[PDB]
């Protein structure tokens, strides 16, 4: 067969479609010379639409089968494709993001070769293929084969940087993903050279496409702060400080970047489809109480590595920014997100991991804007504070202390914006009363004295 499996594995109907495609494409060729073969092939393709799609998928699978046959069948596919294979590329995306868990290594290599051929030839819609293949890279992992795949696609992208240039959104996607890989990867001399290549490419993209990097969002700064020790980023930051218009005339300054918003695509794209689908299933089907089994399974299977601590922060950011449930499902008795946030926070077994997770939680709180943002970014927080008062006071106290002390520490020239965002969030909680009264929580008897004192001092309005 092609995909690794055993007898107990389910008979995959997509794979049976692929097998039927193998049958028609091979048995029709019959080892005759390519001339009559492509003549008959074009006849069968032009007979109708579903058989055209079947021939295209057979050619695609043959490209994943054997090298010489991959060359010949890619030749034949480029020769016989009618619509430019756009829906064929769609099915390539589906097969890719669905069956990559079971794809064989030789098939992986030949699929990478096909991706390189498509990118070099400049076939339309290749940006979608590039960004969905990019999405399958798992963050916070050190498997040799995954790192090799990342290096190979990086090489593909570097040789075709102009194709990235003509694809506006792909610039932002690629630079963000490679920054995430940079903060993930370290440890070996080969990884050091890989780090050098990635940082050089990212700096070149950032300078040459600063205007395009504007729409990435505030998380760009979050990636920058972890890789600020390299003198290139320090030089770029100093150049921005001295004259932000120098690098881009329309780029007035950091005001637009700070006031801007982060789109869900960047937060979503670093996760493989399986984890996102599991979280959607949990937030759509799992009732309150059963969350322990699924999350423990995911933790033991995957989140059991040194880099998993930052992966927890990544998952927290994904939940906060991307997951925006409806109010109708909120009213129902489905599993509240406070339990999810509590499980995410309690698994931080190191102080640095907890600090990173809390910074991730408070990243949206810096620049709150009621008109363009939903209350879903603070409802799990207030629910955690209200629900964890009795059973787990420690988590509530730690979060409150961190969010109270981050206000002057973060940036005194822009601490006023932090206070403005906190006041906006408090006003948003007041106007949409999730809780009956906020008064008992502000001056809770079991909380420490200084916290309540500074809460009274900073916000006399809510007193």
């Amino acid at each position: 067969r092609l995909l690794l499996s055993t007898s107990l594995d389910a008979k995959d109907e997509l794979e049976e479609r692929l097998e039927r495609c193998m049958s028609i494409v091979t048995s029709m060729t019959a080892g005759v010379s390519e001339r009559e073969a492509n003549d008959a092939l074009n006849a069968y393709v032009c007979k109708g639409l579903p058989q055209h799609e079947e021939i295209c998928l057979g050619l695609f699978t043959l490209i994943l089968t054997e090298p010489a046959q991959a060359q010949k069948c890619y030749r034949d596919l480029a020769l016989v494709s009618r619509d430019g294979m756009n829906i064929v590329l769609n099915k390539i995306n589906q097969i890719l993001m669905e069956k990559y868990l079971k794809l064989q290594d030789t098939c992986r290599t030949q699929l990478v070769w096909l991706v390189r051929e498509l990118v070099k030839s400049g076939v339309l819609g290749a940006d979608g293929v590039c960004m969905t293949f990019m999405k399958q890279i798992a963050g916070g992992d050190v498997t040799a084969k995954n790192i090799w795949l990342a290096e190979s696609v990086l090489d593909i992208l570097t040789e075709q940087r102009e194709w990235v240039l003509k694809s506006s959104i792909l610039i932002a996607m690629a630079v963000y993903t490679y920054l995430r890989l940079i903060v993930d990867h370290h440890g070996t001399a080969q990884l050091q050279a890989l780090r050098q290549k990635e940082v050089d490419f990212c700096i070149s993209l950032l300078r040459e496409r600063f205007m395009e990097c504007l729409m990435i969002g505030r998380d760009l700064v979050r990636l920058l702060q972890n890789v600020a020790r390299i003198p290139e980023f320090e030089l770029l930051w100093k150049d921005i400080i001295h004259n932000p218009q120098a690098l881009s005339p329309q780029f007035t300054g950091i005001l637009q970047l700070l006031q801007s918003r982060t789109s869900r695509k960047f937060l979503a794209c670093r996760l493989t489809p399986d984890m996102e689908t599991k979280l959607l299933f949990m937030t759509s089907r799992v009732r309150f109480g059963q969350q322990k089994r699924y999350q423990d399974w995911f933790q033991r299977q995957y989140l059991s590595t040194p880099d998993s601590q930052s992966l927890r922060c990544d998952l927290i950011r994904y939940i906060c920014g991307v997951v925006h449930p409806s109010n109708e499902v909120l009213s129902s008795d489905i599993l509240p997100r406070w339990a999810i946030i509590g499980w995410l926070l309690t698994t931080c077994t190191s102080n640095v991991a907890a600090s990173n997770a809390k910074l991730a939680l408070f990243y949206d709180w810096l620049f709150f804007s009621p008109d363009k943002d939903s209350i879903m970014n603070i409802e799990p927080a207030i629910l955690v504070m209200h629900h964890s008062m009795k059973p787990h006071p420690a988590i509530t106290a730690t979060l409150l202390d961190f969010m109270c002390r981050i206000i002057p520490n973060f940036y005194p020239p822009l601490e006023g914006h932090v206070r403005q965002g906190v006041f906006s969030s408090l006003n948003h909680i007041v106007e949409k009363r999730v809780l009956a009264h906020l008064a008992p929580l502000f001056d809770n008897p079991k909380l420490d004295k200084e916290l309540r004192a500074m809460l009274r001092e900073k916000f006399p309005e809510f007193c």
């Binding site: 032009c46 109708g48 639409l49 055209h52 009618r82």
Partner: peptide, 13 residues
């Protein structure tokens, strides 16, 4: 399909 009358043959691929 303004270039083909509705009572004209349909080119089924």
């Amino acid at each position: 399909s303004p270039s083909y009358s509705p009572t004209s043959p349909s080119y089924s691929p």
